[PDB]
Amino acid sequence: QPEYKCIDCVFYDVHIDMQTQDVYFGFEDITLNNQKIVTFKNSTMRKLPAALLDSFRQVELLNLNDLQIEEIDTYAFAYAHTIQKLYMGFNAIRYLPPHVFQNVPLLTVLVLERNDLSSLPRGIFHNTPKLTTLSMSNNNLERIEDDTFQATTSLQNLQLSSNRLTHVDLSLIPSLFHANVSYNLLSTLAIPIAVEELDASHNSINVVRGPVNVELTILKLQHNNLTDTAWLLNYPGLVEVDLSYNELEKIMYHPFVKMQRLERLYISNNRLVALNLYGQPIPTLKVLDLSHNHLLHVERNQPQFDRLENLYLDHNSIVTLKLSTHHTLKNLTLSHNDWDCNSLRALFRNVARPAVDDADQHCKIDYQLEHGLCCKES
Template identity: 30%
Template structure:
């Protein structure tokens, strides 16, 4: 027998020698049962396909698959697994599904073997730690899903072509080398995507529902055909202006964009611009290929929006019935303004935004920049000033007193600046030392150097990573200890049951022996009675 289908049979337990006589079994379906514990599958060394999905598994022994070296497809999704068994001996493993379980962390050497691994699904768990760097040595690995977890950082293995990391808390991305074609990063905390510049084979990129303010790496993705950056904080988006781009689907909705890209999109089919601050958009050559457009809730100039309204009215799928803004008017289902008024309104808002942004940056730079004393306080000058003040009338004396107070405050501030500069220099020296340590040991932590991030920020990440790793190691040790104790308890229970069974067998054997002795006596008595009956029968019937 090479195939056994035991799906949906209400099986609760797999006995120790359940497959003792199934040495040739290759495919085993145990889907949709009530199994809660897995000890091992040693009795089926030729097993290739094993489906344990949709059970109630909470515990799998660490060496459960130690003898299943031929296993290629292992499905354990939709269970309650919180700790993984070892996979190191499964040399032929190609597909592994761990989705919809209770995993909180995957150790850094979990996939130390498995050179043939092609697909890995760990979605819908509670993962806080899973360093994908350990998968770099899997040349056949093309698909990974870690979506719907609690990951804060993401390392992209160089050979993976499709990666799904939606719905996490990712704020840091690292991709030293990249072969990605499809990348899904929606619903995260991403502010910087410069690491994706190496992904020149990208075809589908979803960055929606993040915290991006600008994008300028599209020129590094010449094959990109589907880009979704909806629901971000984009003020600008830069495309290569001179070269035609194969982009077919572009979603810019729900951002803060005012002007669109001006390059050639002669293959564009779907374009979503709704819920921005667009005044105009140069559709150009894309007018010939577009078949779906969303334009609502912008600052459109009535003059600039006329072209698409006249030529492609039928492809606009979000028509307004009324305009909320009293200064806008409804033009063929799209709210728009007089161009001059719209431009001036938006220009005023942009100036205010830029002013606030520059002031904040200026203050931040002044806080971090070492400053030399700008104004010196010279004692003779102060004395001369006092002499002049004595000669002035009472109307001007108050002003000079105030000036003297200000200069005293300036002198005090200068001293603080000098002190802060000295302190900052010391901090920079310490930071430089720590930076060298970080660069020395960064490989051990899986956190590469980031060119534009300050040492203190990198150190913070290393410290957090180290703490998480320590906590995960402690949790793993505790769980391993509990597992050993539970295993010992089960062994003691089984030994006790075995001893009880042996005692019961001995008792039953003794009872059987007594019964046989009695049976032998009864047979002898029966024979004597029969002889007596035969001997006396003539006289009885006489």
């Protein structure tokens, strides 16, 4: 019958396995265990016992990170009424008892990152209306049911990256400020009204929906299945959007005409054969990544290119490129294309290395190096 004491409370060398019977925490007199901040060092609790919070009833911040927890006793959080921040990440927890969060009304932060959760009990967060930050990344979740966040009307940060999710409707959480659903199996993305940073990279998304949102500033959608970009018109505040590794076949200026401050646009590794940002260039654009596509003719985009600081054209089939004497490029990639030699000679009157970041090493029979890049004379 071990008795673990603090030494505002750090437990040392607590070792509870599944077999272990009841153990003791703090002083027998509950009133002496008035510590508000609880953490463990060099400890393992394969099952989280009720004895901990039965004895410490004034805990506000409970850190159970990396305690090798596999199971939570059903009534572990019976006397947890004062807890505001609960950290239970980096364990091996397989399920949450249905009413585990029934008596934590003041909960604002909950971390369950890196565990073994495969589903959420109905009503798990129905009694935690103050919840503002939640992480359940690195679990095995397949579905977030639509009633999950009905009560969490102040939820601001939601991290669900690296699960197996085929459904989670973020439109049902209008309070969202930061949301991360990267590395899942989503096919549809509804973007809530006020989210400022949203990462839905590494999914299977082919449709983007939602109301005009003037707050969205960072949108990560790389590694999905997008075939259009019209929906971009709904996000006039974007500063960065990553559309790389999708199925886009053309980029036109139309979807970007409402962009007030877009600076970084990544579109590498798509299937682009057409590019028109000259009808109406994006005035604020600084970085444009068009590498690894199937572009052939892009010279008409000069007015857009002239204003950039970084332009990546490598790995296409581009034949010509024109820049004004006063262009602002600081980083340019050009290798692995299909250059006309005359175009390269003209180009290098206004730009050179190391601004030009790359080069071709060898050329095919009909080609030769012109300023370090393969080209054919015509």
